[PDB]
Amino acid sequence: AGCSDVSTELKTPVYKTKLTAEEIRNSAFKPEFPKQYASYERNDETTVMTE
Amino acid sequence: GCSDVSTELKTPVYKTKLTAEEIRNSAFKPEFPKQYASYERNDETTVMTE
Amino acid sequence: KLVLGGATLGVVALATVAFGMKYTDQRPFCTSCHIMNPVGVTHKLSGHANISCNDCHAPHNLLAKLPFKAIAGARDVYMNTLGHPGDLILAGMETKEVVNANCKACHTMTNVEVASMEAKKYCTDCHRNVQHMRMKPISTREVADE
Amino acid sequence: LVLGGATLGVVALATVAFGMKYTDQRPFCTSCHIMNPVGVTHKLSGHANISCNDCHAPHNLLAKLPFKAIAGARDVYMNTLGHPGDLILAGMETKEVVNANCKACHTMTNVEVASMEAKKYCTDCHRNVQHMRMKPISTREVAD
Ligand code: HEC
Ligand code: HEC
Ligand code: HEC
Ligand code: HEC
Ligand code: HEC
Ligand code: HEC
Ligand SMILES: CCCCCCCc1cc(O)c2ccccc2[n+]1[O-]
Ligand SMILES: CCCCCCCc1cc(O)c2ccccc2[n+]1[O-]
C-alpha cells in the first residue's frame, strides 16, 4: 500500500508567496494562508476569563 | 519478508568547520556539545575515593 | 505433472502472504500516511528503531495477530478517509495492553526478580520516552503538513 | 485436482518453515548432552528468551539455510564418529556470524561511537554474553 521510509530530517514545508519583500499589510497574507489567518483572527475573542 | 534493521551500524566519520591548526577548546564546543559537557565534568574538585 | 503446478502455486501463495504480512508490520508501510510521521520519526530516532512497529503494536502470536492487524488496519483506513481525527492521537486501552505485553515479551530476564509489574500499570510509566519521546520539545518530533 | 496440489503446497512450506524455526531453539539444540553447559548458561542469561541461532546463525534467509545444514551436519558427525576434546571453542566462522548478530540487534546503542574498532568482537567487553565463562565451574557444568 506504501513503500519508502520516513525522514529523520524533519523538513519544514517551503513556500513562495506572491508578496513583495516589504509587504506588511496583514490582510495581504489572507488569500494564501487562509487556515493560519483564520486562526490569527481568533485573537478577536475578548470575553473568556481563566482563574 | 523484509528486514526492519533500517539503520545499519557504521563507524562515525566526522568533518568539522574548524581550521587545521585550531587548538582552542571553545571552538570544539559547538560541534560536539555532548563530549564537551562530559569534558567539563573534570572541573569537579571535592570528591575523594579511598 | 498437473498437481506439481498446483504445489508450485501453493508455495507462491503462502510466500506472498507471509512477505505481505511482514511488510505490513514495518516503518515504511506504516508511515505511508503523513499522519503517522511524528511516531515514525521518534521511532527511527529511538533505541527501538531497528524493530518493526508491529513488534510493539501487534500481538506476537500468529492466531491473535492476523485479526488484530485487519481490525486496526480497517479502522485506521477509515479514520484517514471518512472520519475526522482530533488534535490528539492517543493509544486506546486495547493497544496500551498489546504493547505492554510486548514489553514483557522482550525484557523478561531483566525483570525476573522484581515486582516491577505491580508498581505501575505499564512499563512505560517509568520508561516514559519509549512512548515516542513524548517529553522532548515539539520541534524534535513534528512539523506542519504540505 | 490442482486445488489438491495447492493444499499440498501450503502444507509443504508450512512444515518446512516450522521445522526451520524449531531447529533454531534451545530445546532442539540441547537434545545433545554435550550442549547442556551452553543451554543452561543461556537460559540463565539476559538472552534466554531468544533462540540460539538468533545468535548462532545468519539472519538472512539465503545465507542461513546452507549455514544451518553445514554446522548441523558437522555437529552430528562430531557427536557420533568423531572425538570432541575437553575444550569446546567457537571456530573463526561462528565468532563472525555471532558478532554480526550483536550488531543486528544493538545498533542504536552504538551509532555514535567507534566501538567496532576498539576490540575485534563486542564480547571482548561484554564477556559474559559468552555463556558466562567467568562464573565458577559449578554454576555451569556437571558430570555425565
Ligand atoms: C503500522 C502497521 C501502523 C501501526 C503500528 C499504527 N498505525 Fe496508525 N492511525 C491512523 C490514523 C488516522 C489514526 C488516528 C485514529 C484516532 O483518531 O483514534 C491512527 C491511530 C493509530 C494508533 C493509536 C490509536 C489506537 O489505539 O489504535 C496506533 C497505536 C497506530 N495508529 C499504530 C492512520 C494510519 C494509516 C493510514 C491508512 C496507516 C497505514 C497506519 N496508521 C499504520 C499504523
Ligand atoms: C542448535 C541449533 C545448536 C547450536 C546453535 C550449536 N549446537 Fe553444537 N556441537 C555438537 C558437538 C559434538 C560439538 C563439539 C565438536 C568439537 O569439539 O569440535 C558442538 C560444538 C558446537 C559449537 C562450537 C563449534 C562451532 O561451530 O563454532 C557451536 C557454536 C555449537 N555446537 C552450536 C553437537 C551438537 C548436536 C548433536 C548432534 C546438536 C543437536 C547441537 N550441537 C546443536 C547445536
Ligand atoms: C547470543 C546472545 C547467544 C545466544 C542466544 C547463545 N549463544 Fe552460544 N555463544 C555466544 C557467544 C558470544 C559464544 C562465544 C564466541 C567466541 O568468540 O568465543 C558462544 C559460543 C557457543 C558454543 C561453544 C563455544 C563457547 O564459547 O562455549 C556453543 C556450543 C554455543 N555457543 C551454542 C549455543 C546454544 C546451544 C545456545 C542455546 C541454548 C546458545 N549458544 C545461545 C552467544 C550466544
Ligand atoms: C518500543 C515499542 C514501540 C514501537 C517499536 C513503536 N511504538 Fe508506537 N507506541 C508505543 C508506546 C509505549 C505508545 C503509547 C502507549 C500508551 O498510551 O500507553 C505508542 C503509541 C503509538 C501511537 C499513538 C499514541 C501516542 O502516544 O502517540 C501511534 C500512532 C503509534 N504508537 C504508532 C507507531 C508506529 C507507526 C510505529 C513505527 C514507526 C511505532 N508506533 C513504533 C511504543 C512503540
Ligand atoms: C536477536 C536479538 C539479539 C541478539 C542477536 C543479541 N542480543 Fe543482546 N539483547 C537483545 C534483547 C531483546 C535484550 C534485552 C532482554 C532483557 O531485557 O532481558 C538484550 C540485552 C543485551 C545486553 C544486556 C544484558 C546482558 O546480558 O548484558 C547486552 C550487553 C547485549 N544484549 C549485548 C549483546 C551482545 C554482546 C550480543 C552478541 C553476542 C547480543 N547482545 C546478541 C537482543 C539481542
Ligand atoms: C521484539 C523486540 C522488543 C520489544 C517489543 C521491546 N523491546 Fe525494548 N529493546 C529491544 C532491544 C533488542 C533493545 C536494545 C536496543 C539496542 O541495543 O540498540 C531494546 C531496548 C530497550 C531499552 C533501552 C533503550 C531505551 O529506550 O531506554 C528500554 C528502556 C526498553 N527496551 C524497554 C522496552 C519497553 C518499555 C518496551 C515496551 C514498549 C520494549 N522495550 C519493547 C527489544 C524489544
Ligand atoms: C488481512 C490482513 C492484512 C492487512 C494488514 C493491515 C496492516 C496494519 C495496518 C494498520 O493501520 C495497523 C495499525 C495498528 C496496528 C497494526 C496495523 N496493521 O497491522
Ligand atoms: C530443516 C533443515 C534444518 C537442518 C538441521 C540443522 C539444525 C542445526 C544444528 C546444529 O548443530 C547447529 C549448530 C550451529 C548453528 C546452527 C545449527 N543448526 O541450525
XYZ file of C-alpha atoms and ligand atoms in Angstrom:
687
model
C 0.000 0.000 0.000
C 3.056 2.282 0.503
C 6.805 1.739 0.476
C 9.537 4.380 1.175
C 10.988 5.150 4.650
C 10.414 8.245 6.859
C 12.901 11.055 7.015
C 14.947 11.876 10.154
C 15.397 15.420 8.790
C 12.020 16.903 9.694
C 11.979 19.309 6.717
C 9.592 22.272 7.311
C 7.382 22.880 4.242
C 8.695 25.523 1.847
C 6.660 28.440 0.488
C 6.880 31.015 -2.272
C 4.249 33.745 -1.845
C 3.191 36.296 -4.444
C 4.082 39.043 -1.920
C 6.777 41.735 -2.251
C 9.855 41.852 0.017
C 8.394 44.735 2.026
C 4.728 43.654 2.304
C 3.466 44.417 5.824
C -0.363 44.567 5.465
C -1.883 41.637 7.374
C -4.798 41.160 5.011
C -2.351 40.572 2.149
C -1.372 37.215 3.664
C -5.014 36.099 3.817
C -5.650 34.610 0.404
C -2.517 32.421 0.534
C -2.700 31.284 4.159
C -6.425 31.061 4.995
C -6.057 28.499 7.791
C -3.376 30.370 9.800
C -5.191 33.687 9.176
C -8.487 32.171 10.354
C -6.616 31.085 13.482
C -4.978 34.522 13.850
C -8.443 36.086 13.868
C -9.398 34.030 16.940
C -7.474 36.667 18.947
C -10.551 38.885 18.454
C -12.274 36.901 21.230
C -12.401 39.152 24.292
C -14.962 37.680 26.718
C -13.383 34.472 28.101
C -11.691 34.534 31.510
C -9.457 31.929 33.276
C -8.621 31.840 37.025
C 9.577 -10.721 4.484
C 11.900 -7.669 4.618
C 14.316 -6.700 7.410
C 13.340 -3.998 9.962
C 17.066 -3.111 10.540
C 16.767 0.148 8.553
C 19.611 1.908 10.457
C 22.879 -0.002 9.910
C 25.760 0.288 12.345
C 28.574 2.310 10.794
C 31.798 3.749 12.178
C 31.268 7.534 12.584
C 33.088 9.746 10.113
C 33.448 13.417 11.095
C 34.008 16.652 9.134
C 34.264 19.838 11.220
C 34.132 23.544 10.328
C 37.451 24.017 12.141
C 40.770 25.072 10.583
C 43.668 22.539 10.501
C 45.648 24.152 13.371
C 42.796 25.001 15.769
C 43.816 24.486 19.418
C 41.156 26.487 21.316
C 38.908 24.248 23.396
C 35.895 26.581 22.983
C 35.972 26.133 19.209
C 35.174 22.413 19.694
C 32.116 23.117 21.849
C 29.592 23.968 19.112
C 30.087 20.799 17.006
C 30.429 18.323 19.896
C 28.380 19.653 22.881
C 27.939 16.177 24.388
C 31.610 15.212 24.619
C 32.223 18.781 25.753
C 29.700 18.680 28.631
C 31.432 15.413 29.658
C 34.876 17.088 29.418
C 33.598 19.832 31.724
C 32.953 17.265 34.447
C 36.706 17.452 35.141
C 36.050 20.761 36.960
C 34.738 18.726 39.938
C 37.288 19.046 42.742
C 35.555 17.923 46.000
C 35.277 14.105 45.744
C 37.851 11.724 47.302
C 37.814 7.970 46.782
C 39.865 5.999 49.352
C 2.582 -33.089 -13.761
C -0.707 -31.236 -13.063
C -0.542 -31.353 -9.240
C 3.128 -30.170 -9.456
C 1.735 -26.950 -10.925
C -0.713 -26.860 -8.001
C 2.114 -27.318 -5.489
C 4.101 -24.558 -7.221
C 1.093 -22.211 -6.912
C 0.721 -23.194 -3.236
C 4.279 -22.217 -2.237
C 3.991 -18.899 -4.094
C 0.654 -18.104 -2.428
C 1.956 -18.625 1.137
C 5.304 -16.955 0.361
C 3.443 -13.864 -0.902
C 1.063 -13.806 2.106
C 3.968 -14.169 4.550
C 6.016 -11.435 2.875
C 2.949 -9.126 2.809
C 2.257 -9.962 6.441
C 5.771 -8.866 7.406
C 5.918 -5.815 5.150
C 2.649 -4.553 6.652
C 4.434 -4.518 10.049
C 7.353 -2.213 9.260
C 8.027 1.548 9.482
C 7.870 2.278 5.736
C 4.393 0.808 5.341
C 3.040 2.488 8.491
C 4.422 5.888 7.554
C 2.851 5.979 4.107
C 0.228 8.068 5.944
C 1.551 11.555 6.708
C -0.431 11.482 9.967
C 1.971 8.757 11.243
C 5.162 10.769 10.686
C 5.679 12.030 14.250
C 5.580 8.411 15.501
C 7.751 7.290 12.563
C 10.441 9.868 13.279
C 10.505 9.334 17.022
C 10.785 5.589 16.352
C 13.686 5.878 13.926
C 15.445 8.136 16.381
C 14.967 5.836 19.416
C 16.694 2.711 20.711
C 13.888 0.626 19.175
C 14.491 1.892 15.624
C 15.640 -1.484 14.272
C 12.478 -3.385 15.267
C 9.125 -3.024 13.488
C 6.104 -1.048 14.728
C 4.029 -4.183 14.999
C 6.795 -5.781 17.051
C 5.301 -3.465 19.647
C 1.859 -2.655 18.212
C 0.574 -6.153 17.290
C 0.391 -9.392 19.282
C 3.312 -11.791 18.637
C 1.016 -14.878 18.468
C 0.138 -15.780 14.830
C -3.558 -16.542 15.525
C -4.123 -13.385 17.601
C -2.112 -11.187 15.199
C -3.941 -11.774 11.900
C -7.340 -10.467 13.199
C -5.757 -7.611 15.216
C -3.911 -6.413 12.097
C -7.088 -6.450 9.964
C -9.199 -4.697 12.610
C -6.720 -1.921 13.434
C -5.902 -1.754 9.706
C -9.532 -1.332 8.677
C -10.145 1.189 11.487
C -7.063 3.245 10.521
C -8.042 3.440 6.796
C -11.482 4.611 7.857
C -10.096 7.304 10.182
C -7.749 8.563 7.459
C -10.549 8.838 4.898
C -14.172 9.310 6.068
C -13.596 10.077 9.759
C -12.268 13.271 11.368
C -9.191 12.690 13.639
C -8.567 15.065 16.555
C -5.630 17.210 17.577
C -4.652 14.410 19.955
C -3.784 10.929 18.754
C -3.828 8.632 21.756
C -3.422 4.899 22.114
C -6.730 3.279 23.102
C -6.967 0.825 26.029
C -6.564 -2.230 23.763
C -3.302 -1.049 22.198
C -1.809 0.065 25.583
C -2.373 -3.592 26.501
C -0.838 -5.334 23.484
C 2.181 -3.018 23.759
C 2.841 -3.622 27.442
C 2.544 -7.368 26.819
C 5.250 -6.977 24.162
C 7.434 -5.075 26.637
C 7.233 -8.168 28.777
C 7.951 -10.352 25.704
C 11.430 -8.924 25.085
C 12.586 -7.746 28.510
C 11.570 -10.595 30.786
C 15.078 -11.530 32.015
C 15.898 -8.028 33.155
C 12.784 -8.113 35.368
C 12.584 -11.753 36.695
C 13.336 -10.982 40.343
C 11.428 -7.827 40.890
C 7.704 -6.983 41.170
C 8.036 -4.283 38.513
C 4.722 -5.453 37.124
C 2.779 -4.439 40.248
C 4.291 -0.972 40.809
C 2.901 0.996 37.803
C 0.169 -0.229 35.430
C 2.508 -0.154 32.393
C 6.319 -0.338 31.948
C 6.178 2.991 30.157
C 5.002 4.732 33.322
C 8.722 4.635 34.096
C 10.262 4.180 30.677
C 8.401 7.322 29.544
C 10.306 8.076 26.342
C 9.782 4.601 24.841
C 6.388 6.182 24.246
C 7.635 8.060 21.178
C 9.781 10.597 23.030
C 6.794 12.464 24.366
C 8.859 14.605 26.725
C 11.128 16.177 24.104
C 10.313 19.631 22.628
C 7.660 19.734 19.866
C 10.219 20.766 17.212
C 12.114 17.481 17.572
C 9.006 15.454 16.587
C 6.602 17.398 14.446
C 6.135 19.882 11.566
C 3.155 21.259 9.606
C 1.609 19.479 6.615
C 2.374 20.151 2.933
C -7.256 -31.607 -8.959
C -4.954 -28.569 -8.759
C -6.788 -27.453 -5.561
C -5.385 -30.655 -4.022
C -1.964 -29.615 -5.359
C -2.300 -26.144 -3.798
C -3.359 -27.730 -0.481
C -0.205 -29.898 -0.601
C 1.910 -26.839 -1.431
C 0.834 -24.782 1.600
C 1.370 -27.778 3.905
C 4.847 -28.442 2.481
C 6.104 -24.884 3.069
C 4.318 -24.546 6.437
C 6.080 -27.738 7.600
C 9.475 -26.606 6.272
C 9.146 -23.182 7.940
C 8.072 -24.636 11.272
C 10.946 -27.157 11.151
C 13.359 -24.394 10.192
C 12.322 -22.403 13.310
C 12.202 -25.380 15.664
C 15.773 -26.341 14.662
C 16.770 -22.865 15.937
C 15.604 -23.071 19.527
C 17.093 -24.196 22.869
C 15.193 -27.447 23.264
C 16.313 -28.765 19.851
C 19.932 -27.687 20.429
C 20.161 -29.237 23.876
C 18.892 -32.637 22.788
C 22.642 -33.426 22.838
C 24.003 -33.676 26.397
C 27.267 -32.116 25.262
C 25.323 -28.857 24.649
C 23.979 -28.612 28.201
C 26.521 -26.157 29.667
C 25.689 -23.665 26.869
C 21.977 -24.452 27.280
C 21.984 -23.659 30.985
C 24.102 -20.561 30.748
C 21.756 -19.360 28.000
C 18.538 -19.927 29.957
C 20.046 -18.171 32.942
C 21.251 -15.110 30.945
C 19.633 -11.918 29.625
C 19.316 -13.571 26.201
C 17.243 -16.550 27.444
C 14.131 -15.569 25.512
C 15.810 -15.529 22.090
C 16.855 -18.709 20.214
C 20.445 -19.996 19.869
C 20.513 -19.412 16.127
C 19.307 -15.835 16.694
C 22.933 -15.566 17.706
C 24.486 -18.596 16.046
C 23.107 -18.435 12.501
C 22.907 -15.641 9.937
C 19.569 -13.733 9.902
C 19.480 -13.635 6.071
C 17.278 -16.444 4.647
C 19.621 -17.321 1.739
C 22.746 -17.387 3.939
C 21.033 -19.249 6.833
C 19.768 -22.398 5.055
C 23.294 -23.579 3.992
C 24.910 -22.438 7.308
C 22.378 -24.484 9.289
C 22.924 -27.624 7.184
C 26.725 -27.351 7.274
C 27.025 -26.698 11.012
C 24.274 -29.263 11.576
C 25.970 -31.969 9.515
C 29.320 -31.212 11.183
C 27.780 -31.325 14.689
C 26.095 -34.711 14.068
C 29.413 -36.050 12.835
C 31.302 -34.756 15.875
C 28.713 -36.276 18.194
C 28.923 -39.696 16.561
C 32.066 -40.740 14.658
C 34.490 -38.009 15.809
C 36.025 -37.478 19.253
C 35.468 -33.994 20.757
C 38.090 -32.525 23.088
C 37.933 -31.248 26.640
C 37.518 -27.733 25.227
C 34.616 -26.740 23.035
C 35.509 -23.473 21.359
C 33.729 -21.432 18.733
C 35.598 -21.531 15.390
C 36.511 -18.329 13.453
C 33.386 -18.566 11.262
C 30.945 -18.711 14.187
C 32.732 -15.895 16.109
C 31.971 -13.888 12.945
C 28.266 -14.733 12.453
C 27.676 -14.082 16.141
C 29.351 -10.696 16.272
C 27.363 -9.670 13.178
C 24.197 -10.579 15.073
C 25.401 -8.478 18.042
C 25.430 -5.642 15.561
C 21.989 -6.679 14.196
C 20.089 -6.043 17.464
C 22.099 -3.410 19.300
C 22.917 -0.957 16.529
C 21.141 2.045 18.065
C 23.076 1.766 21.324
C 26.319 2.069 19.346
C 25.580 4.542 16.448
C 27.768 7.401 17.646
C 30.795 5.565 18.950
C 33.611 3.622 17.227
C 33.017 0.558 19.461
C 33.578 -1.643 16.429
C 37.227 -0.576 16.045
C 38.369 -0.924 19.696
C 38.101 -4.663 20.262
C 37.732 -7.272 17.478
C 34.372 -8.531 18.848
C 31.715 -6.988 21.113
C 32.192 -9.877 23.511
C 35.718 -8.674 24.289
C 33.885 -6.262 26.578
C 30.535 -7.997 27.111
C 32.465 -11.069 28.274
C 29.607 -12.951 29.970
C 27.292 -12.901 26.913
C 29.753 -15.605 26.025
C 27.862 -18.174 28.135
C 29.009 -16.778 31.471
C 32.536 -18.055 31.049
C 33.764 -16.165 34.112
C 31.462 -17.729 36.702
C 32.710 -20.740 38.767
C 32.527 -24.178 37.074
C 29.810 -25.481 39.414
C 27.334 -22.891 38.071
C 27.591 -24.216 34.535
C 28.645 -27.818 34.428
C 28.226 -31.319 35.982
C 29.359 -34.835 35.077
C 27.537 -37.130 32.577
C 1.648 0.030 11.078
C 1.373 -1.285 10.990
C 0.816 1.011 11.948
C 0.799 0.999 13.269
C 1.615 0.006 14.115
C -0.103 2.055 13.719
N -0.619 2.689 12.613
Fe -1.962 4.328 12.727
N -3.613 5.630 12.700
C -4.022 6.304 11.569
C -4.943 7.345 11.964
C -5.654 8.356 11.048
C -5.078 7.243 13.479
C -5.936 8.130 14.405
C -7.143 7.343 14.908
C -7.808 8.062 16.066
O -8.094 9.293 15.944
O -8.061 7.398 17.118
C -4.215 6.148 13.841
C -4.004 5.686 15.115
C -3.044 4.776 15.499
C -2.743 4.404 16.867
C -3.432 4.990 18.137
C -4.882 4.557 18.342
C -5.000 3.066 18.558
O -5.105 2.640 19.737
O -5.013 2.302 17.556
C -1.755 3.492 16.821
C -1.071 2.787 18.012
C -1.401 3.254 15.437
N -2.208 4.053 14.656
C -0.424 2.384 15.012
C -3.615 6.032 10.279
C -2.785 5.025 9.845
C -2.664 4.542 8.482
C -3.445 5.038 7.245
C -4.090 4.138 6.474
C -1.765 3.556 8.460
C -1.320 2.754 7.209
C -1.277 3.372 9.817
N -1.920 4.292 10.636
C -0.333 2.440 10.208
C -0.067 2.076 11.503
C 21.369 -25.788 17.799
C 20.880 -25.205 16.695
C 22.896 -25.824 18.085
C 23.771 -24.814 18.087
C 23.459 -23.324 17.801
C 25.073 -25.372 18.391
N 24.949 -26.714 18.575
Fe 26.502 -27.900 18.648
N 28.162 -29.269 18.853
C 27.993 -30.642 18.947
C 29.273 -31.273 19.221
C 29.592 -32.769 19.428
C 30.282 -30.132 19.278
C 31.790 -30.247 19.581
C 32.598 -30.585 18.345
C 34.018 -30.119 18.578
O 34.512 -30.248 19.744
O 34.646 -29.611 17.594
C 29.499 -28.945 19.044
C 30.008 -27.688 19.006
C 29.246 -26.576 18.809
C 29.779 -25.246 18.621
C 31.273 -24.864 18.565
C 31.765 -25.153 17.143
C 31.464 -24.025 16.166
O 30.737 -24.255 15.169
O 31.955 -22.883 16.358
C 28.729 -24.437 18.475
C 28.776 -22.924 18.227
C 27.510 -25.211 18.577
N 27.861 -26.521 18.775
C 26.247 -24.691 18.487
C 26.808 -31.323 18.811
C 25.539 -30.815 18.683
C 24.336 -31.612 18.493
C 24.273 -33.157 18.367
C 24.065 -33.681 17.148
C 23.300 -30.773 18.399
C 21.817 -31.156 18.169
C 23.814 -29.428 18.529
N 25.188 -29.480 18.701
C 23.070 -28.279 18.485
C 23.623 -27.029 18.392
C 23.711 -14.501 21.857
C 23.172 -13.727 22.828
C 23.914 -16.014 22.111
C 22.923 -16.878 22.329
C 21.409 -16.543 22.330
C 23.541 -18.178 22.566
N 24.923 -18.042 22.469
Fe 26.287 -19.577 22.227
N 27.741 -18.310 22.019
C 27.607 -16.935 22.033
C 28.932 -16.368 22.051
C 29.324 -14.888 22.078
C 29.914 -17.530 22.041
C 31.463 -17.458 22.047
C 32.016 -16.694 20.845
C 33.527 -16.718 20.895
O 34.146 -15.961 20.107
O 34.133 -17.485 21.705
C 29.082 -18.708 22.025
C 29.587 -19.993 21.997
C 28.866 -21.142 21.863
C 29.335 -22.519 21.942
C 30.749 -23.114 22.185
C 31.844 -22.071 22.299
C 31.799 -21.428 23.657
O 32.242 -20.246 23.753
O 31.326 -22.088 24.624
C 28.269 -23.305 21.757
C 28.317 -24.850 21.758
C 27.102 -22.461 21.553
N 27.509 -21.152 21.642
C 25.823 -22.871 21.294
C 24.726 -22.204 21.768
C 23.468 -22.819 22.139
C 23.158 -24.328 22.038
C 22.647 -21.859 22.588
C 21.194 -22.071 23.102
C 20.984 -22.765 24.236
C 23.361 -20.602 22.500
N 24.634 -20.846 22.016
C 22.878 -19.365 22.838
C 26.439 -16.209 22.034
C 25.182 -16.725 22.189
C 9.101 0.105 21.770
C 7.823 -0.096 21.407
C 7.193 0.760 20.280
C 7.497 0.736 18.984
C 8.552 -0.171 18.324
C 6.664 1.714 18.303
N 5.854 2.305 19.246
Fe 4.139 3.329 18.883
N 3.626 3.368 20.899
C 4.460 2.842 21.870
C 4.004 3.256 23.170
C 4.628 2.891 24.531
C 2.766 4.113 22.920
C 1.866 4.805 23.977
C 1.100 3.744 24.781
C 0.144 4.327 25.817
O -0.650 5.275 25.504
O 0.160 3.812 26.977
C 2.624 4.128 21.483
C 1.643 4.807 20.816
C 1.535 4.948 19.456
C 0.640 5.835 18.744
C -0.363 6.840 19.345
C -0.087 7.069 20.834
C 0.987 8.101 21.017
O 1.464 8.283 22.176
O 1.357 8.739 20.004
C 0.834 5.640 17.447
C 0.085 6.397 16.337
C 1.857 4.620 17.278
N 2.262 4.227 18.533
C 2.363 4.100 16.100
C 3.620 3.546 15.912
C 4.306 3.377 14.641
C 3.784 3.776 13.247
C 5.486 2.822 14.881
C 6.538 2.510 13.806
C 7.231 3.525 13.260
C 5.606 2.598 16.303
N 4.456 3.064 16.904
C 6.665 2.029 16.958
C 5.563 2.048 21.661
C 6.152 1.740 20.463
C 18.129 -11.213 18.055
C 18.344 -10.297 19.005
C 19.666 -10.183 19.837
C 20.892 -10.659 19.583
C 21.279 -11.499 18.353
C 21.756 -10.273 20.682
N 21.013 -9.549 21.574
Fe 21.660 -8.575 23.141
N 19.736 -8.200 23.769
C 18.620 -8.446 22.982
C 17.419 -8.230 23.761
C 15.960 -8.401 23.314
C 17.904 -7.806 25.152
C 17.013 -7.447 26.370
C 16.425 -8.664 27.099
C 16.153 -8.262 28.539
O 15.920 -7.037 28.767
O 16.181 -9.139 29.461
C 19.358 -7.810 25.047
C 20.250 -7.497 26.034
C 21.599 -7.304 25.869
C 22.527 -6.831 26.871
C 22.140 -6.520 28.322
C 22.026 -7.893 29.019
C 23.359 -8.606 29.226
O 23.411 -9.866 29.291
O 24.411 -7.927 29.354
C 23.739 -6.787 26.321
C 25.088 -6.373 26.931
C 23.605 -7.205 24.961
N 22.293 -7.523 24.713
C 24.625 -7.288 24.058
C 24.649 -8.281 23.119
C 25.825 -8.934 22.600
C 27.280 -8.619 23.023
C 25.384 -9.846 21.713
C 26.259 -10.807 20.880
C 26.795 -11.890 21.427
C 23.931 -9.789 21.656
N 23.525 -8.819 22.533
C 23.084 -10.544 20.871
C 18.677 -8.832 21.676
C 19.736 -9.467 21.086
C 10.622 -7.529 19.883
C 11.558 -6.761 20.464
C 11.328 -5.684 21.578
C 10.188 -5.156 22.087
C 8.719 -5.469 21.719
C 10.554 -4.183 23.105
N 11.928 -4.130 23.198
Fe 12.862 -2.747 24.327
N 14.582 -3.286 23.315
C 14.747 -4.385 22.479
C 16.142 -4.495 22.069
C 16.781 -5.555 21.145
C 16.840 -3.317 22.758
C 18.337 -2.938 22.667
C 18.469 -1.803 21.660
C 19.903 -1.573 21.264
O 20.832 -2.042 21.979
O 20.121 -0.905 20.224
C 15.794 -2.645 23.499
C 15.985 -1.521 24.254
C 15.170 -1.089 25.257
C 15.512 -0.058 26.191
C 16.857 0.705 26.151
C 16.681 1.940 25.254
C 15.646 2.922 25.808
O 14.819 3.468 25.012
O 15.638 3.160 27.059
C 14.466 0.078 27.027
C 14.298 1.034 28.227
C 13.465 -0.872 26.613
N 13.913 -1.562 25.534
C 12.259 -1.080 27.188
C 11.208 -1.550 26.472
C 9.809 -1.260 26.720
C 9.267 -0.343 27.856
C 9.125 -1.928 25.775
C 7.618 -1.959 25.534
C 7.079 -0.885 24.949
C 10.050 -2.631 24.924
N 11.326 -2.374 25.379
C 9.691 -3.420 23.857
C 13.750 -5.256 22.091
C 12.420 -5.034 22.284
C -5.777 -9.202 6.221
C -4.513 -8.725 6.922
C -3.660 -7.796 6.055
C -3.881 -6.330 6.427
C -2.680 -5.746 7.162
C -3.019 -4.459 7.919
C -1.735 -3.793 8.418
C -1.934 -2.866 9.606
C -2.419 -1.576 9.381
C -2.608 -0.684 10.437
O -3.093 0.568 10.202
C -2.273 -1.119 11.819
C -2.447 -0.263 12.906
C -2.120 -0.696 14.189
C -1.626 -1.988 14.374
C -1.458 -2.842 13.281
C -1.781 -2.412 11.988
N -1.618 -3.267 10.854
O -1.175 -4.413 11.012
C 15.118 -28.479 8.282
C 16.601 -28.373 7.947
C 17.469 -27.995 9.155
C 18.779 -28.788 9.273
C 19.181 -29.039 10.734
C 20.236 -28.055 11.245
C 19.985 -27.562 12.684
C 21.269 -27.048 13.328
C 22.078 -27.948 14.046
C 23.272 -27.533 14.653
O 24.060 -28.412 15.355
C 23.662 -26.097 14.517
C 24.843 -25.611 15.086
C 25.195 -24.267 14.951
C 24.357 -23.413 14.238
C 23.180 -23.897 13.663
C 22.819 -25.242 13.796
N 21.619 -25.744 13.207
O 20.885 -24.969 12.570
